[PDB]
């Protein structure tokens, strides 16, 4: 629908690519559009488990620009899923697809697709004069795992870039400060790792020793 001025032959977009052209024989304006379009994801279990896959076409509404069509075609809000059988049950999420849809390899085995379950349904018996009070208790022990430090690294720039080459080293002498800056950043990281470990573990400065008699009223450590 573009109307070119008579001195114009090509049209360009914001990315400076030619998206419109005037045909030189019949002086009509033609839009130019790239052929390739649309995100593609592949869904697999382990290759040690099976070689079956499911392919998600993120910009295809199957209700085609697909590689192949199988017996199982399921349309999600994350795209058109091909190769997975849709079931009506809700499970926990195994392989996340997106928009509330997950995938799994279940039982004569195939890839299934389902809506993820958020949890078990519950209803509290609320009343304006009723209370629930526990009669017992459970002593529970749970684990929490937190990273504290990572590995400290150092880099020889001349060894990495110009390994045992004098001509390369002499040409690399024109940069210098960039490698000093990289090693400054890595040295800061390396000092920070030991600081992290000290701040987590060296809180108390008295090395307390446990008593030799381990009678703690029945509690055992």
């Amino acid at each position: 629908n573009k109307k070119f001025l008579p001195f114009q032959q090509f049209g360009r977009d914001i990315a400076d690519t030619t998206d419109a052209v005037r045909d030189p024989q019949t002086l009509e304006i033609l839009d130019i559009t790239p052929c390739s379009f649309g995100g593609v994801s592949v869904i697999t279990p382990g290759t040690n488990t099976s070689n079956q896959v499911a392919v998600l076409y993120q910009d295809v509404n199957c209700t085609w620009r697909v590689y192949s069509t199988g017996s199982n075609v399921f349309q999600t809000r994350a795209g058109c899923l091909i190769g997975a059988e849709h079931v009506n049950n809700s499970y926990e999420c195994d392989i996340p697809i997106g928009a509330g849809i997950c995938a799994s390899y279940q039982t004569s085995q195939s890839i299934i697709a389902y809506t993820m379950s958020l949890g078990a349904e519950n209803s509290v018996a609320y009343s304006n004069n009723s209370i629930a009070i526990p009669t017992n208790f459970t002593i529970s022990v749970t684990t929490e795992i937190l990273p504290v430090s990572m590995t400290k690294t150092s880099v020889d720039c001349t060894m990495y870039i110009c390994g045992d080459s004098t001509e390369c080293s002499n040409l690399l002498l024109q940069y210098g400060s960039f490698c000093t800056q990289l090693n400054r950043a890595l040295t800061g990281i390396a000092v920070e790792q030991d600081k992290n470990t000290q701040e987590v573990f060296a809180q108390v400065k008295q090395i307390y020793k446990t008593p030799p008699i381990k009678d703690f009223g029945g509690f055992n450590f």
């Binding site: 526990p134 017992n136 880099v155 870039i161 950043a185």
Partner: protein, 245 residues
């Protein structure tokens, strides 16, 4: 000490002193199950393993990126220097130098971002050490699921593991409750607990463990008359002084 922590989570210490053997058995059994749980699952130490794997992958990616030509005729310094005189070679060497310097800069930038994330994790771990190991925390879910009693640290490669000991209520029972009790034209409110009824008789118990007691003047306090509290229930409040007279 564990009775003090029970007082911390709002349970009277006689509950602990009367169930000490059961509490010690439950604690020992849970600590014993921790070892079995960690040994049974293989993805327990996934965070520490991902830290190790990410550092190894970054170094190996740096090693593999030396095969990039970066627009030069070859990625091999010796192959460039064997075929070309120094003026023609210097262009290719400068291309390789720019590309490899970019690779080192990308590695250092991603290491700085990862170190910031690790620093946030270590600050959280130090806070959890101070507030769960060196004390008893009132913050919900900061030191495990349930009412926090105490925590124990354990050293791990590139990290720390906390064993949060918590109090989880169990075996709840329905009761009829009331906000206040009218005895002598006065409204009576519980000092520390909650009024409950088993169907016929009214008691007052602590809120986190069922321990019913006779509603007395020592158990309650008096505020106003019985005309303003919505849902006040007629019951007797036993004064212990008057039987002694």
């Amino acid at each position: 000490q564990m009775a003090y922590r029970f007082n911390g989570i709002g349970v009277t210490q006689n509950v602990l002193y009367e169930n000490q053997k059961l509490i010690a058995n439950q604690f020992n059994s849970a600590i014993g199950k921790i070892q079995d749980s960690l040994s049974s699952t293989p993805s327990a130490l996934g965070k520490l393993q991902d830290v190790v794997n990410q550092n190894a992958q970054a170094l190996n990616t740096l090693v593999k990126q030396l095969s990039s030509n970066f627009g030069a005729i070859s990625s091999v310094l010796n192959d460039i220097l064997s075929r070309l005189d120094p003026p023609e070679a210097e262009v290719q060497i400068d291309r390789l130098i720019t590309g490899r310097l970019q690779s080192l800069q990308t590695y250092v930038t991603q290491q700085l971002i990862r170190a910031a994330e690790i620093r946030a994790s270590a600050n959280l771990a130090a806070t959890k050490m101070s507030e769960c190991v060196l004390g008893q925390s009132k913050r919900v879910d900061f030191c495990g699921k349930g009412y926090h009693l105490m925590s124990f640290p354990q050293s791990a490669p590139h990290g720390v593991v906390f064993l949060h000991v918590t109090y989880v209520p169990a075996q709840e029972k329905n009761f009829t409750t009331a906000p206040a009790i009218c005895h002598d034209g006065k409204a009576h409110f519980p000092r520390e607990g909650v009024f409950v009824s088993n169907g016929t008789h009214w008691f007052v118990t602590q809120r986190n463990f069922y321990e019913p007691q006779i509603i007395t003047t020592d158990n309650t306090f008096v505020s106003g008359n019985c005309d303003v509290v919505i849902g006040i229930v007629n019951n007797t409040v036993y004064d212990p002084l008057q039987p002694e007279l």
